[PDB]
Structures are given as structure tokens and as C-alpha cells.
XYZ file of C-alpha atoms in Angstrom:
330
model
C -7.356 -10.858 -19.307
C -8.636 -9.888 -16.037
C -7.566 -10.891 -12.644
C -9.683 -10.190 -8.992
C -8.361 -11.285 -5.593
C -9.233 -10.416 -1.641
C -6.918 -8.436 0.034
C -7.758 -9.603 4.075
C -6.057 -6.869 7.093
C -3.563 -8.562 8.872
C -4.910 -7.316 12.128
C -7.964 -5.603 14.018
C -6.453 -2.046 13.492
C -5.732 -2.557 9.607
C -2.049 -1.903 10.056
C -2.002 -3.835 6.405
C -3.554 -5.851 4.000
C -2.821 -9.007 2.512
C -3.461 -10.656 -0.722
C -2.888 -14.286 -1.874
C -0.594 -14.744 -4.693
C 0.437 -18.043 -6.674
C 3.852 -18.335 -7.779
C 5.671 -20.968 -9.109
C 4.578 -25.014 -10.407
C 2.834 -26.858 -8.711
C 2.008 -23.171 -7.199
C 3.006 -22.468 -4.154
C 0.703 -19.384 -2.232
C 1.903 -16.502 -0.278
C 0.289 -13.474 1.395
C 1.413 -10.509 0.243
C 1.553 -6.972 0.896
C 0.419 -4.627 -2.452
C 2.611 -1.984 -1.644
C 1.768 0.794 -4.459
C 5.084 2.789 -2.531
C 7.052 0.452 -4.180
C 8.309 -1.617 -7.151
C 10.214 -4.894 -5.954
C 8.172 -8.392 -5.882
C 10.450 -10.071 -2.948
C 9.025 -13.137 -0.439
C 10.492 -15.028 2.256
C 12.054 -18.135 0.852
C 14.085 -20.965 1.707
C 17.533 -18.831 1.309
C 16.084 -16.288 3.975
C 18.368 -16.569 7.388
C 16.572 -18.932 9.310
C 17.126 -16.974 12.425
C 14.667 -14.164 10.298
C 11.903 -16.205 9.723
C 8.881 -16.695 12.601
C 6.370 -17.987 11.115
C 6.181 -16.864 7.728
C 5.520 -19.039 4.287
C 8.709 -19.257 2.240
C 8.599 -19.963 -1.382
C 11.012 -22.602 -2.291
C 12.694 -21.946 -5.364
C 14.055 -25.766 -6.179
C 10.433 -27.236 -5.730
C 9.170 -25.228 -8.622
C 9.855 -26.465 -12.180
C 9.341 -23.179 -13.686
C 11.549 -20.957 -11.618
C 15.071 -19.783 -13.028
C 18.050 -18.362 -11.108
C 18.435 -14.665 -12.747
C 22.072 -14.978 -12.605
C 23.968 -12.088 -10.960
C 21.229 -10.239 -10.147
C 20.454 -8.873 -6.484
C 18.366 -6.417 -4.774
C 18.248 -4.576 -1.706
C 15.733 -2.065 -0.606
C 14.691 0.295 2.441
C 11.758 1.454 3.210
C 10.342 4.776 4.788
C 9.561 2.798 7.799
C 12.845 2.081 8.410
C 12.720 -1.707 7.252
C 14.781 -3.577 4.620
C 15.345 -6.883 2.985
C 17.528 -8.079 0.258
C 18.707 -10.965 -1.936
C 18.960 -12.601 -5.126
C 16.478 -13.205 -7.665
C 14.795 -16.252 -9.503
C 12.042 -15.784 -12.632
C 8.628 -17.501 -12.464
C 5.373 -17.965 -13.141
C 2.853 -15.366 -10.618
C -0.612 -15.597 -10.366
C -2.599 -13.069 -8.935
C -6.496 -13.514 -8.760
C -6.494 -15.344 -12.132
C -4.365 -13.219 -13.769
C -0.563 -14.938 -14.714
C 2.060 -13.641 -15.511
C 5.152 -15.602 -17.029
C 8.975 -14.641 -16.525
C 8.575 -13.045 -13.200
C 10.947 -11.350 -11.151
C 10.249 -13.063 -7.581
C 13.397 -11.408 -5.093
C 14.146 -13.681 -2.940
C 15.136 -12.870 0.578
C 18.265 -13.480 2.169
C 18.242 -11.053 4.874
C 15.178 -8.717 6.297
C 15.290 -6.694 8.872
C 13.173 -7.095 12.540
C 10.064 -5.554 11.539
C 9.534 -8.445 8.617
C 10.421 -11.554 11.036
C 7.846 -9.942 13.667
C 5.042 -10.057 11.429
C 4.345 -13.986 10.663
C 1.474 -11.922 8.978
C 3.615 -10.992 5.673
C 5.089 -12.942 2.915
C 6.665 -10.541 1.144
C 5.936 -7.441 -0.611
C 4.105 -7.157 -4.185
C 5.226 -3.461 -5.724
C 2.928 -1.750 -7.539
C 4.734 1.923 -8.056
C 6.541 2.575 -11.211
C 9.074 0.248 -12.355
C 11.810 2.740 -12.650
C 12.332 2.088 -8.405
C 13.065 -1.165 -8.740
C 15.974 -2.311 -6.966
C 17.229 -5.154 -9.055
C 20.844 -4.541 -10.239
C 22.706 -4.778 -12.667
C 19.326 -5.237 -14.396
C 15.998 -3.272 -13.702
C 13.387 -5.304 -13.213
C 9.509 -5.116 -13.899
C 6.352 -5.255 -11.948
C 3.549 -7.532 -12.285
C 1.294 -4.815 -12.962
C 4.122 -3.585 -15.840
C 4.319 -7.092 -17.218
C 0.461 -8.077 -17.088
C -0.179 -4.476 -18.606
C -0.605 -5.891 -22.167
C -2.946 -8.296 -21.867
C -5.137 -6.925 -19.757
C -8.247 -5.675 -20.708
C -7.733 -2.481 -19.577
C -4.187 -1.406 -18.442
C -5.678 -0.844 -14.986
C -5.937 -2.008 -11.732
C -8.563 -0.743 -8.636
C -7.782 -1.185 -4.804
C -10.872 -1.594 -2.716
C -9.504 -1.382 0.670
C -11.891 -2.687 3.816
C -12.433 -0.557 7.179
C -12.220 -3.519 9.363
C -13.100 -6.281 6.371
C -11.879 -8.050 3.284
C -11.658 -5.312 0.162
C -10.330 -6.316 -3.315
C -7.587 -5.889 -6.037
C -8.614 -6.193 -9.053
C -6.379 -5.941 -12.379
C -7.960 -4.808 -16.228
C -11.278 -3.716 -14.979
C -12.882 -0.993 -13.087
C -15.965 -2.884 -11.360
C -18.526 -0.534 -11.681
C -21.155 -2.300 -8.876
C -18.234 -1.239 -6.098
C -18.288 2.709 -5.919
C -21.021 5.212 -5.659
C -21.280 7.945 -7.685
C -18.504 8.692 -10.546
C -14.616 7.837 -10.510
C -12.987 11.522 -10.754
C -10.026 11.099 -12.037
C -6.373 13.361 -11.095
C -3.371 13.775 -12.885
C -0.194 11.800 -11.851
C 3.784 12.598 -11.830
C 5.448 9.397 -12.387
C 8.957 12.262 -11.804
C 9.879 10.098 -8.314
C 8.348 6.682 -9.358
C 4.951 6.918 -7.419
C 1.135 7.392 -7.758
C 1.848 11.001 -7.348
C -1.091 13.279 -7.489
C -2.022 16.633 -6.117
C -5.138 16.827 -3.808
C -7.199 20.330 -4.023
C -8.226 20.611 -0.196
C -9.415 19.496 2.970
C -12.382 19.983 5.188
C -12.191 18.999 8.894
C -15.429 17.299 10.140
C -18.535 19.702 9.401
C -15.710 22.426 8.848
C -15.644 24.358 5.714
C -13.570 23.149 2.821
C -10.210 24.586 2.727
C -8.374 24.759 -0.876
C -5.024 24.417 -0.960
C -2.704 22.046 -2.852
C -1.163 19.081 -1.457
C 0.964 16.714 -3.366
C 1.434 13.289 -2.178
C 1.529 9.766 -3.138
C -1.512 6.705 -3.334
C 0.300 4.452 -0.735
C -1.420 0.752 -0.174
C 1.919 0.142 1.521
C 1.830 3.155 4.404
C -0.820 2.317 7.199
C -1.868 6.327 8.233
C -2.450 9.232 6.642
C 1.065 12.363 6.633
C -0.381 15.344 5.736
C 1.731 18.992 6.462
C 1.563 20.000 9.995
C -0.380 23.174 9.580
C -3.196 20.253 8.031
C -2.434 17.899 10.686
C -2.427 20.267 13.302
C -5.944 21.628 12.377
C -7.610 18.386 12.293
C -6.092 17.248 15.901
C -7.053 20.941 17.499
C -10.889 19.491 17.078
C -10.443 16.471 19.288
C -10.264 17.385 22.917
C -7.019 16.465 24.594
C -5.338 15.800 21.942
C -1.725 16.348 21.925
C 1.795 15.172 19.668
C 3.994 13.511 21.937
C 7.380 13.299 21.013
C 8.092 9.859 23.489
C 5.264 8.103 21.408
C 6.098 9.529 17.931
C 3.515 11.230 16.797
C 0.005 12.748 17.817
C -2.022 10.982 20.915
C -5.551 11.605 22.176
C -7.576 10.074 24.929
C -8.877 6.875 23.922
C -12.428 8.295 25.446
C -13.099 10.524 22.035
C -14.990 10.585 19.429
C -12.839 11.885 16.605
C -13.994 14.285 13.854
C -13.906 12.824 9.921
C -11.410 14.101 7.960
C -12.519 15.327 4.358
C -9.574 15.484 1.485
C -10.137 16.574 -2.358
C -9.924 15.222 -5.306
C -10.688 17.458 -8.354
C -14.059 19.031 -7.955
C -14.905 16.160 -5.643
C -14.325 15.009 -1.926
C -13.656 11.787 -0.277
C -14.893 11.868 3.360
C -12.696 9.608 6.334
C -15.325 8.831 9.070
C -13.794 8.983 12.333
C -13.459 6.028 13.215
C -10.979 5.190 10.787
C -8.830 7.532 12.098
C -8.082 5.572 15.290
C -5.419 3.373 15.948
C -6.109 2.104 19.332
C -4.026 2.421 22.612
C 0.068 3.287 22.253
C 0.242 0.319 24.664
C -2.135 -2.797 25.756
C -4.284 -1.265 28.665
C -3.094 2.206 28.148
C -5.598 5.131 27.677
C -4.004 7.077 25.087
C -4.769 5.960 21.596
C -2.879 6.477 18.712
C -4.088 8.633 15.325
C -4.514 7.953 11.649
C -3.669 11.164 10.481
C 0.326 12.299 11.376
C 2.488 15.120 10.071
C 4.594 14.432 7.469
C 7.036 16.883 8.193
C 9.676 14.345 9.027
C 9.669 12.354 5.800
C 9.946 14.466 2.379
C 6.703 13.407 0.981
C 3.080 13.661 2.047
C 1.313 9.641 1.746
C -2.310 8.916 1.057
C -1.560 5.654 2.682
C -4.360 3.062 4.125
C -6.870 5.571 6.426
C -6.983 7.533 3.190
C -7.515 4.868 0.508
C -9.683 2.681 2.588
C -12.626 5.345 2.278
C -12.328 5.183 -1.537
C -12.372 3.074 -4.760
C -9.267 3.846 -6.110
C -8.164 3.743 -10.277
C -4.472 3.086 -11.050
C -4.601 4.103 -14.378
C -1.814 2.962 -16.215
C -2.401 4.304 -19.522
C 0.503 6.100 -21.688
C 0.064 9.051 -19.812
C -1.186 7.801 -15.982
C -4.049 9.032 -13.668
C -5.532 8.556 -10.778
C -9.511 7.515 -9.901
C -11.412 8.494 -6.465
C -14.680 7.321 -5.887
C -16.952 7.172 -2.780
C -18.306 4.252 -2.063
């Protein structure tokens, strides 16, 4: 089996991406963030506080005739952003592009924090990380991607992120008419549940490649890119006025600029960032000073390939026995 679906941004700066997903009978639809950070399927719902949902869809557990109360299990997770949710947990049937998968583990919400009831935008999360950080207790759950894995053609699935535009997850094919070039594949650690992988460099615009090591996670889940500060610091020292601010969070430059691309490695091969994908638009409506794509990670443990990176490339998740990772232009 095989399964294909659009994944549309949520806004005009990409700040995430949404895909449709099916779950339950009659199905009911819900936009949902593929967060390959993570490993818990959980959706608004009609448990969720009502004072914590504006706007959202909510599944409804007791319309669908194929759900099923997992009984005693809950769940409870935090993200890197500082966001959480938690709740209890039903089994159904989730359809993704085409692609279904029976017995389910759909978290339902009964508390998320203020970031989730701003953004009508969002559903709920999809995980796509390694099953082993799911937060389901007493019993571990699986993720859709674990519990298609068998019957798809190919125990794969692609992300196709859009600059600006629709892009496409697809699950059990690699579709060879949406990269240029080859797919060079990169060894993964699956030691801290991610799409860990090690990039060999970076090149700053027209700079000259610099090789050097940098481990850090495939993130569809994290909008920008955290890089180490000596990396970060390089790339911002090309864009005139640039500056980190610690008031704002991170670094700022004027909104006038035309930024430098930012080059990263994978393998032998390089996947170039224009630019422009690199802003982020003003800190504030009106103001002049515009936000960047590519921050330090310093702060956080872990450097992310999140959005800005993956956007520029045709991405593999290779779930084989022993996983990789695929980059390819495109």
C-alpha cells in the first residue's frame, strides 16, 4: 500500500504545515501537524476544556463506531517550544492520503496549553519520530508510520515541504518525478528517538564550504533552522545590521536586506537555502526589524533541521531495519 496527501502552511511565513487526516467511521477530517520531533498522534476532541478550544476541529470519539476507549491509558507531553497537551486515549481507524491504518492510537486532548488554543490552524499533532518517545503510559504506543510500516510498499515515507505553497507526504514510495538529481542518503541514530543524522558542513552564500560535523535532528515539527553559534554567528555576520537581541529572542536584521543562502551538507552533497527562506518577517506588525530562519541552538541541547532546512529538500525517512536518511535538491 501506498498513501500521498498535501501538506498546506498554516500561514504566509510557513510557521507550519498541515495535512488532512481521516480518522474514525463515518470519518471525521482533521488538519494535522507531521511533527517528525515527535511520536504521539493526539487531536482536539470533544473531552478538550472548552475554554482551550478557538476554533479548532475536534474529533468526537462517541460519533465514531470504530473508536475504542484504551482503558487506563493517558499521555502527556511537552514540547521544546514550551507547549503541552495531555489526555486519554481511544483506538481507531486513521487514514492518511489513502493509506489506513486500523487500531490506532488517537490521544485525545483534555488539556493543551495557550500556544495550541491560539492556533485555530492545528488539529493536533501526527508524530512521526521513533516510537520509543511515545508518551502513552502504562502502555507505549505506536505511530502511524510504525503501524502502516508493513504493508507498505516500501517502509518509507518522503516530506516535500513548500516555500510559500502546498508540498506533500507521501508514505511507501519515493516519487522519483519530485527531486532533481540523486537522493544521498546519511546514516541515522535512533539513540534519543529522532531522525538523527550528522551533516558534513556548511557554506555561507558564495562562501567556501566549511567541513565540520554537526549532529542534529530532521524536524517537520520545528519552524527555523538551530545550528551552533559559531555556525549561526557566521552566517548572520554577512547580512548588514544584523544583530541577536536578547528582548526579541533570538537574531534580528533590518527588514531592508537581502539575506545570503545558507548551504548545509549532506554526505558528499549539498542542499542550498535561498535567502529568502530564511526570513521570517517583522518581530511585530509595522515594525522594521525582521526576524531570521536560522537561530543558535545553544539554548536547547540539540541542533534541529526543522522547516527552513527541509523545505529546500526532498527528504527520505527510511525506515528500514537499520534507518537512514535521503536529501535531494529539487
Amino acid at each position: 500500500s501506498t498513501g500521498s496527501a498535501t501538506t498546506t502552511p498554516i500561514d504566509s511565513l510557513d510557521d507550519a504545515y498541515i495535512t488532512p487526516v481521516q480518522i474514525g467511521t463515518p470519518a471525521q477530517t482533521l488538519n494535522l501537524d507531521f511533527d517528525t520531533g515527535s511520536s504521539d498522534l493526539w487531536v482536539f476532541s470533544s473531552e478538550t476544556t472548552a475554554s482551550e478550544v478557538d476554533g479548532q476541529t475536534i474529533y468526537t470519539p462517541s460519533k465514531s463506531t470504530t473508536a475504542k476507549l484504551l482503558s487506563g491509558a493517558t499521555w502527556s507531553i511537552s514540547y521544546g517550544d514550551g507547549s503541552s497537551s495531555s489526555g486519554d486515549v481511544y483506538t481507531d481507524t486513521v487514514s492518511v492520503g489513502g493509506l489506513t491504518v486500523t487500531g490506532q492510537a488517537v490521544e485525545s486532548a483534555k488539556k493543551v496549553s495557550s500556544s495550541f488554543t491560539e492556533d485555530s490552524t492545528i488539529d493536533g499533532l501526527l508524530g512521526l519520530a521513533f516510537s520509543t518517545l511515545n508518551t502513552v503510559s502504562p502502555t507505549q504506543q505506536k505511530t502511524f508510520f510504525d503501524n502502516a510500516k508493513a504493508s507498505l510498499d516500501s517502509p518509507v515515507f518522503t516530506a516535500d515541504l513548500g516555500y510559500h505553497a502546498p508540498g506533500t507526504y507521501n508514505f511507501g514510495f519515493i516519487d522519483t518525478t519530485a527531486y532533481t538529481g540523486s537522493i544521498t542518503y546519511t546514516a541515522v541514530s535512533t539513540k534519543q528517538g529522532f531522525w538523527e543524522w550528522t551533516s558534513t558542513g556548511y557554506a555561507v552564500g558564495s562562501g567556501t564550504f566549511k567541513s565540520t560535523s554537526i549532529d542534529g535532528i530532521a524536524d517537520t515539527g520545528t519552524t527555523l533552522l538551530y545550528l551552533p553559534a559559531t555556525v549561526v554567528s557566521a552566517y548572520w555576520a554577512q547580512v548588514s545590521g544584523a544583530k541577536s537581541s536578547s528582548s526579541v529572542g533570538g537574531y534580528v536584521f533590518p527588514c531592508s536586506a537581502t539575506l545570503p543562502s545558507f548551504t548545509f551538507g549532506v554526505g558528499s552533497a549539498r542542499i542550498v537555502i535561498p535567502g529568502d527562506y530564511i526570513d521570517f518577517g517583522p518581530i511585530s506588525t509595522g515594525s522594521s526589524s525582521c526576524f531570521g530562519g536560522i537561530q543558535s541552538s545553544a539554548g536547547i541541547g540539540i541542533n534541529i533541521f526543522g522547516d527552513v532546512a527541509l523545505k529546500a529538500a526532498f527528504v527520505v525517512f527510511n525506515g528500514a531495519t537499520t534507518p537512514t536518511l535521503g536529501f535531494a535538491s529539487k
